[PDB]
Amino acid sequence: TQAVEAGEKTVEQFVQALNKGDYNKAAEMTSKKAANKSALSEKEILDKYQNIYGAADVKGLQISNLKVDKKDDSTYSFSYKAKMNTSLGELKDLSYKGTLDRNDGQTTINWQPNLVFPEMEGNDKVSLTTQEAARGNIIDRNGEPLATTGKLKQLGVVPSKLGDGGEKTANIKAIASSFDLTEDAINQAISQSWVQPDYFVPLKIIDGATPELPAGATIQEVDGRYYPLGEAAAQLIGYVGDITAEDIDKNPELSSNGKIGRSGLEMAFDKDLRGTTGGKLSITDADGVEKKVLIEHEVQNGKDIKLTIDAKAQKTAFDSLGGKAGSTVATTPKTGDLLALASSPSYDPNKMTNGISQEDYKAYEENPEQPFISRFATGYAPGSTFKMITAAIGLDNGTIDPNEVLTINGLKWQKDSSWGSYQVTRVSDVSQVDLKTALIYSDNIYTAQETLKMGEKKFRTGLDKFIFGEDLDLPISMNPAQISNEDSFNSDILLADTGYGQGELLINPIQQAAMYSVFANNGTLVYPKLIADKETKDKKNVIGETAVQTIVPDLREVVQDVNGTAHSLSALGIPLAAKTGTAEIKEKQDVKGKENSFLFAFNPDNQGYMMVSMLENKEDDDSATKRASELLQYLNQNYQ
Ligand SMILES: *C(=O)[C@@H](NC(=O)Cc1ccccc1)[C@@H]1N[C@@H](C(=O)O)C(C)(C)S1
């Protein structure tokens, strides 16, 4: 029985060597070649496993229900059940039998071809036929396509039908001029090592209409992934790339010929979009006639995915950022439907998924404004926009009297002399400041004093009723918002800065839209939703109804009052409640610090839409309010 345990260890080591993919190690655990022992030599067994398991992309061999008993003086029968993963899914309940040979002081496996698959005889062969699945679509709330499989017009040249050294340069310059292509790049393409004279060398995809084709140029129809909105949704949707051998080694169910999601929703929803590969894995006779079918299922095309996104709102929100750094979130605040998630600047996902030059890709990566960032999912200090949450907290716990008038003299203020050189700063020298005045002029000193008056304990008590620390049920990679680094401020200065949205606060635009939805639901926080069919989830009694009915009229005055910080939006003539902000950021990079512009706005009459826009590292005389007119007009018209 001390040898039965040795045979157990031998079978375990053999299964492990197969599982780890080291077929040489597994083959060396077999006895010598014979008719009573192993059916093949070690190198023959290695090539058999390598060829067959590699053809089926076998990964993760796991055994169970093992039993091994003595059969003769040196024979030891073993048996187990096996499960393994292939290109067509899981092979479950595989019954493996065999024999072991004990000799001298070592136990080896009398190898037989039934140790590759249970029903394999002498020189049986394995066949695998597969049908690739079509990738599902991503569509907006009205069925318009955001990511589909289209028929693209590929442009290319045949170097043989181009010229003979003289007319070649003429046709190269003609094809380079008539298609906005660098004339040096065309020759760089027809001079790669893989090119041959009679070959078709692709260059670029033609977006729509096909110009006149000079000599050598030809248009071939090629089907592939297509993104209609382009850069306007590139961060959200993402792109797909060719599947590599390493992708297959990680997940065998990928079609070693299809496309895999590399970023955004295409990657987050890769499983539901790529479908399931159909086909048949069968054992055949040595002549080629089928013996038994191990696996067989038919193709399952990927299912479509419908988003809450509005395509027209998405394109308008993106275009309004003029290619500058920033982002925009538009929701229906009563349900959380994310109408638009724009981030700028952006990259071309169509030229990214087809053929992207490595200098173009390095330009995207080295761009200081970083077009690959999903800015709607990046944490920022919310700026002066955060006042209206602090004020709502101050109204709930009774610290703030909406009509009590603080007397503020100057543009700088500090609690006492212990603050040193630091002082809270406002832009407008208004002497008599109450709550409505503070929201209209965006007065930091009023907010800082009221925050210090209510104290850290009451402040954090009101803040904890929001979504700080929560992970929203969204297929977008993001970090949870935070009030500060630790659970305590341990600083009056940091407490005041957090009071007007400027401390260690980190809230991304989507989390901002969720927190600010309280003013459109009488203090109920409505979680944002991106998938159209999901049910609305909310969180009641975050702030009081009295605080909403007090602040929202003041937010109307931020627009309508002649000195309100959002008064330019009065030109729209639509019911608006807004709040602006300008956060100062110390970014060690160049001359002094930069600043971000923020705008929050929603319809206070019907609560039909809500918008949060930002400009990151803004230019002088630039702001989010300056650019919000078009998106606000659209949302006001189409979302009552
Ligand atoms: C809120 O964020 C406030 N911003 C500051 O106090 C810092 C600052 C930075 C640059 C210029 C001026 C002030 C106020 N909110 C914005 C705004 O609503 O646009 C103001 C510029 C009114 S300050």
Side-chain angles (χ1 to χ4, degrees), residues 34-36 38-42 44-49:
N36 261 333
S38 296
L40 286 170
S41 79
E42 291 189 350
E44 293 168 321
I45 293 173
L46 159 62
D47 284 336
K48 187 118 185 175
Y49 274 119

Side-chain angles (χ1 to χ4, degrees), residues 383-384 387 425 427 442 444 565 580-582 584 595:
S384 270
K387 287 171 159 67
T425 303
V427 293
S442 196
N444 289 10
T565 52
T580 61
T582 301
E584 196 94 32
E595 50 191 14

Side-chain angles (χ1 to χ4, degrees), residues 10 13-18 21-30 42 45-46:
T10 297
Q13 291 171 317
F14 178 81
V15 170
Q16 183 193 353
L18 287 188
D22 189 1
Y23 305 116
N24 196 347
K25 194 187 201 67
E28 292 173 351
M29 306 183 190
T30 64
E42 291 189 350
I45 293 173
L46 159 62

